[PDB]
């Protein structure tokens, strides 16, 4: 690895993420998010599923 | 899911279980996903 090499010979760091689903409960979840809370109006609420 | 429920109670009975009511609160839920069929208590020795 030299700094003056061509783009096809320069070092590239590769990280491969493998996603699997097993019978055990899935614990690596994506972020769910949240909106601002609005009170005193007829709204559709989704609290913790 | 491994559910661990626990309750701490202050008693003054010397030998047996006291008679009364105490509901156990849920303490921790564990995502283990494994088979469990046997258990064993862990004690502490006293060394001198």
GROMACS .gro file of C-alpha atoms in nm:
model
   97
    1UNK     CA    1   0.000   0.000   0.000
    2UNK     CA    2   0.159   0.324  -0.119
    3UNK     CA    3   0.000   0.673  -0.114
    4UNK     CA    4   0.087   0.727  -0.483
    5UNK     CA    5  -0.091   0.414  -0.610
    6UNK     CA    6  -0.385   0.415  -0.848
    7UNK     CA    7  -0.747   0.408  -0.738
    8UNK     CA    8  -0.773   0.037  -0.820
    9UNK     CA    9  -0.482  -0.054  -0.592
   10UNK     CA   10  -0.548   0.181  -0.299
   11UNK     CA   11  -0.663   0.024   0.030
   12UNK     CA   12  -1.037   0.012   0.091
   13UNK     CA   13  -1.186  -0.065   0.432
   14UNK     CA   14  -1.487  -0.295   0.398
   15UNK     CA   15  -1.746  -0.357   0.670
   16UNK     CA   16  -2.013  -0.613   0.583
   17UNK     CA   17  -2.326  -0.610   0.798
   18UNK     CA   18  -2.517  -0.939   0.806
   19UNK     CA   19  -2.879  -0.931   0.923
   20UNK     CA   20  -3.040  -1.255   1.040
   21UNK     CA   21  -3.370  -1.338   1.207
   22UNK     CA   22  -3.380  -1.632   1.447
   23UNK     CA   23  -3.652  -1.784   1.669
   24UNK     CA   24  -3.511  -1.586   1.964
   25UNK     CA   25  -3.667  -1.239   2.018
   26UNK     CA   26  -3.516  -0.973   1.795
   27UNK     CA   27  -3.328  -0.717   2.005
   28UNK     CA   28  -3.137  -0.506   1.748
   29UNK     CA   29  -3.416  -0.273   1.641
   30UNK     CA   30  -3.413   0.052   1.446
   31UNK     CA   31  -3.495   0.382   1.616
   32UNK     CA   32  -3.868   0.427   1.646
   33UNK     CA   33  -3.874   0.815   1.665
   34UNK     CA   34  -4.139   1.038   1.832
   35UNK     CA   35  -4.354   1.340   1.748
   36UNK     CA   36  -4.455   1.622   1.982
   37UNK     CA   37  -4.739   1.537   2.217
   38UNK     CA   38  -5.072   1.710   2.150
   39UNK     CA   39  -5.340   1.711   2.420
   40UNK     CA   40  -5.713   1.796   2.440
   41UNK     CA   41  -5.786   1.692   2.080
   42UNK     CA   42  -5.921   1.376   1.917
   43UNK     CA   43  -5.601   1.226   1.776
   44UNK     CA   44  -5.474   0.883   1.676
   45UNK     CA   45  -5.232   0.774   1.948
   46UNK     CA   46  -4.962   0.507   1.917
   47UNK     CA   47  -4.800   0.457   2.259
   48UNK     CA   48  -4.541   0.173   2.273
   49UNK     CA   49  -4.721  -0.023   2.004
   50UNK     CA   50  -3.868  -1.387   2.744
   51UNK     CA   51  -3.730  -1.446   3.092
   52UNK     CA   52  -3.948  -1.263   3.342
   53UNK     CA   53  -3.801  -1.193   3.686
   54UNK     CA   54  -4.055  -1.069   3.941
   55UNK     CA   55  -3.937  -0.971   4.288
   56UNK     CA   56  -4.054  -0.835   4.621
   57UNK     CA   57  -3.865  -0.738   4.937
   58UNK     CA   58  -4.050  -0.780   5.266
   59UNK     CA   59  -3.942  -0.690   5.622
   60UNK     CA   60  -4.031  -0.984   5.847
   61UNK     CA   61  -3.942  -1.088   6.200
   62UNK     CA   62  -4.046  -1.456   6.194
   63UNK     CA   63  -3.770  -1.690   6.308
   64UNK     CA   64  -3.819  -2.015   6.119
   65UNK     CA   65  -4.103  -2.062   5.868
   66UNK     CA   66  -4.268  -1.852   5.598
   67UNK     CA   67  -4.493  -1.575   5.734
   68UNK     CA   68  -4.863  -1.578   5.655
   69UNK     CA   69  -4.980  -1.275   5.460
   70UNK     CA   70  -5.026  -1.118   5.119
   71UNK     CA   71  -4.757  -0.949   4.910
   72UNK     CA   72  -4.791  -0.908   4.534
   73UNK     CA   73  -4.464  -0.937   4.343
   74UNK     CA   74  -4.377  -0.646   4.117
   75UNK     CA   75  -4.218  -0.719   3.777
   76UNK     CA   76  -3.850  -0.636   3.804
   77UNK     CA   77  -3.680  -0.723   3.475
   78UNK     CA   78  -3.767  -0.887   3.143
   79UNK     CA   79  -3.477  -1.052   2.964
   80UNK     CA   80  -3.462  -1.123   2.587
   81UNK     CA   81  -3.280  -1.456   2.620
   82UNK     CA   82  -3.454  -1.686   2.366
   83UNK     CA   83  -3.297  -2.002   2.511
   84UNK     CA   84  -3.421  -2.331   2.652
   85UNK     CA   85  -3.401  -2.366   3.031
   86UNK     CA   86  -3.498  -2.685   3.216
   87UNK     CA   87  -3.275  -2.688   3.529
   88UNK     CA   88  -3.163  -2.437   3.791
   89UNK     CA   89  -2.929  -2.418   4.090
   90UNK     CA   90  -2.899  -2.176   4.382
   91UNK     CA   91  -2.569  -1.995   4.445
   92UNK     CA   92  -2.451  -1.953   4.804
   93UNK     CA   93  -2.156  -1.780   4.971
   94UNK     CA   94  -1.898  -1.948   5.193
   95UNK     CA   95  -1.756  -1.802   5.513
   96UNK     CA   96  -1.378  -1.841   5.544
   97UNK     CA   97  -1.170  -1.801   5.860
   0.00000   0.00000   0.00000
